[PDB]
Design a protein around this ligand. Sequence first.
Ligand SMILES: O=C(O)c1cccs1
Ligand SMILES: O=C(O)c1cccs1
Ligand SMILES: O=C(O)c1cccs1
Ligand SMILES: O=C(O)c1cccs1
Lengths: 518, 519
Amino acid sequence: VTPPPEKFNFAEHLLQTNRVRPDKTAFVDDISSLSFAQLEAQTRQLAAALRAIGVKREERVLLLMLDGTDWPVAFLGAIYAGIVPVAVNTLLTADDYAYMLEHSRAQAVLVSGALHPVLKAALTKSDHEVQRVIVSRPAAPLEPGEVDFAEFVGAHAPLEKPAATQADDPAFWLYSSGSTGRPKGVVHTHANPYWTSELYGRNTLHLREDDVCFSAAKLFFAYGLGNALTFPMTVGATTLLMGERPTPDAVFKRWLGGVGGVKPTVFYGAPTGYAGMLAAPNLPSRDQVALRLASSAGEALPAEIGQRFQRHFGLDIVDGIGSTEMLHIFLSNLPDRVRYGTTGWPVPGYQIELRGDGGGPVADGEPGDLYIHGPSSATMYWGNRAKSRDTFQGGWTKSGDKYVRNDDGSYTYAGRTDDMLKVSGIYVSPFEIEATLVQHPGVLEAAVVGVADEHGLTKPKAYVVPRPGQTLSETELKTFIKDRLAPYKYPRSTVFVAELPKTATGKIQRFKLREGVL
Amino acid sequence: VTPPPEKFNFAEHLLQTNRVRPDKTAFVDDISSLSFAQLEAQTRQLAAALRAIGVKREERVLLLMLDGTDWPVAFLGAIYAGIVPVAVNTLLTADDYAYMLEHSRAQAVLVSGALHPVLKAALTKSDHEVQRVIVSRPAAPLEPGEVDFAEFVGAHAPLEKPAATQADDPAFWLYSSGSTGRPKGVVHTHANPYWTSELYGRNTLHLREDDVCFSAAKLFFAYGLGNALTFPMTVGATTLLMGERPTPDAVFKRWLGGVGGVKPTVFYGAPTGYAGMLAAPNLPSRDQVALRLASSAGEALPAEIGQRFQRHFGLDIVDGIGSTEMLHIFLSNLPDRVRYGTTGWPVPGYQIELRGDGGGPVADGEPGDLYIHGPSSATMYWGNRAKSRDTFQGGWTKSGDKYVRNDDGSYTYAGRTDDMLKVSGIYVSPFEIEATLVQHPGVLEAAVVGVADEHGLTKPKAYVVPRPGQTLSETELKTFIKDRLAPYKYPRSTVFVAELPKTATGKIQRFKLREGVLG
Ligand SMILES: O=C(O)c1cccs1
Ligand SMILES: O=C(O)c1cccs1
Ligand SMILES: O=C(O)c1cccs1
Ligand SMILES: O=C(O)c1cccs1
């Protein structure tokens, strides 16, 4: 792969790539479509619009939007102007967003109508710097000074040239959370998505122009950003976008060509989703679908899920691992080489190391902490020097995963170096779930660990000590957690216990909980 | 009143004052009591204990505690050490505390057991700097880094000398909410509570050594911090503290001598509480209480409430106004000169100005914006230069209130400059409540305004447009707010309407709602 030039604007790169195919569909959702020419026009009008309201090069904007055709316009339009979009999860709380507004110093917000209420609450509570709120598909009347995204774009002529950025200039942020503390601002450059799109999208997956890409993983997830924006636009593929929650039925409707007159050829999702679809009574048959490639990431793929999928569809699931910090997948199975029970082989262009308790070598077949050296790594966590130092160890990025290397050079997942759980693509802190449980007045103490479900997939499991003299039912506890946590975070079961295993200092021995002591 | 000396430590001042009465009760609550000598010992031991865990002069600690005897030990022990306690409301959310930990850079937290769950959530999610958590009356097993408050105090000998602070050095913080944006860290000096306690506690209320003080307003409130800490310690009075919510029965129990073998002589609380008490069937008779003085602040007092209290008790309610920023009351009725319908007269030592649209003066009988010049003003809002320069303008502090001066020199409340609601003593933003209601999936739009209840006291009232094809209930939405915000921010009723009145700009015509056009 040839490196990108030193003067490089990622948005202009993707627009230029597709000037050969102006009338091919770039993006389609339930209600709209953009050809590559339409996307280019709207991208550059948006870029002009942000500049016209006073947003300057290198300033951030918050991009808080459901998957739909306006999403890439927002993302690429900011980048075309040399403005840094901060693309965030759509299922967070107003407090989460208020922290992000302050921390990013966002100068504007691009937000879906459905998300305006949570955004409004974040604006009201925070010491933000937001100059304008631009609302895609408003679901309620606009407040004074807010503007509809379509009018905002339509009112400005296209910016005539992109910002003259460098390849190693910040281009966009994602946020990633650890087991405690506020989300961390992962800063990616203009070069980083070129690298993931070339090394993985083109050279590992072999995506091509006649593909139709559809990702259950949303655009704000590193995984989804690649799958359904950077990868397809790199090769000229058409992309299907879906705003709603990805259930089996929602996915199957698109698989069957229910939207935009297109059937996906490439699908991407989490192992949990694949398990859910294989369980579904109305799982489509091989002849109803046009899938040629199924990608998975976000948690280890249990072998039985890949084997079942292969037996039913005659397609393997290609399981890989990436991170927010590395932007996309650096260790993967290949379309024509899949070894179930492993995450495959290092992606060419990425170097992988396993380190022991002192940073030393580990013998094949022994677990080590996984570190990655490759060209898509983020530069830092913005404004967090101590966490940056821990993660970005001079050229090597520490994943937080443990792995074992096998005789054939493949790698098998061996757990985490923190206490995070990966519950269907999404990191979940057990300490967060515990913090929520102990605010129920009937709970004295709580401990949350990961447990494998009937398919081998990790879900939280809560051990709760009830407070003497209060009552507390399991149904009571379910209701309590329902609107306080997002559903992926729901414990799969709660066990009421008389006490928890602890050291003399009162630290909970969570390892004893995973070992079954209760 | 003599100014304090340049070298001045407020805690040391209060301890020194009471070296003449070591065995008199300083503080008593439902389970414990402290004489002045025992308070001094505990205060200085706590001071040493904070130093021993590495907290330095000028660093903050969060004080998140229910009213009881440990509260003044925590507050004065920090100040004795030259450490700055940040005294906060006990009814807030985890998100609320997360922000205060971050913004204060608190190095330790002193917390009541009952508030440990909410603090734990705040510590988990925040980028805080807390090294140790000291837990007063733990209600669950201690975690690593946590220590029982009595064990912590008991583990250290008294600090020999207080920190050598200056009168104008920061001594403590309180947080003040605004209509939008984060709550503001109000910085008070060592001198500030000396001035309030001399100018108001002694010289206006005439508190004396033989009083027993009892405030329904908790210690974290600027009002209660004077009432039940700085005021009584200044004169050697005994103070009754209560952890629980101040309902009429709880208050009456204490008025009657149900706790500590002491009947309060001096009561303090919001007009809301006085209305609740006067409406109560079990309201005590005169001959059952020892009350000699009844103070009110936190909202304007309806004349009818003071008049009924006086008819029943032969005591007036003495209404005054203070602010977090001015630390205590600067405009007040006097114990023997009360004019109901007014907040009385300037407190000697404070100058008061009303200013109209141009910054100029206003005629008597017309409203103006209230500004105060007095010696207890906070210095700034920590880390907020813009709001500091807007509030603290060369010796004048802007209250955000409007008032009218009457012909007799008394002052009558005329509303706010910023749409804040003052609900039972607590400033509440209607915009916070609204932005929260709109997250309800059945709500299309919502506006919240302040409406008088049946006693004339302002409560939030919500006007909601439901989403077409949804039916909502009042109580559902009360719950929805209690589950997300501090609980007393809940709208007392919700009116469901088809549309909100708006300007041509799409701005909500809040004045129409408040004026009752839609009911
Ligand atoms: O495995 C994962 O979580 C990811 C794959 C690509 C970006 S993140
Ligand atoms: O399938 C999904 O929704 C996801 C996989 C990785 C992040 S989200
Ligand atoms: O609860 C009360 O009575 C009050 C709190 C603050 C002023 S009065
Ligand atoms: O009136 C009030 O809110 C206050 C009285 C003394 C401090 S604050």
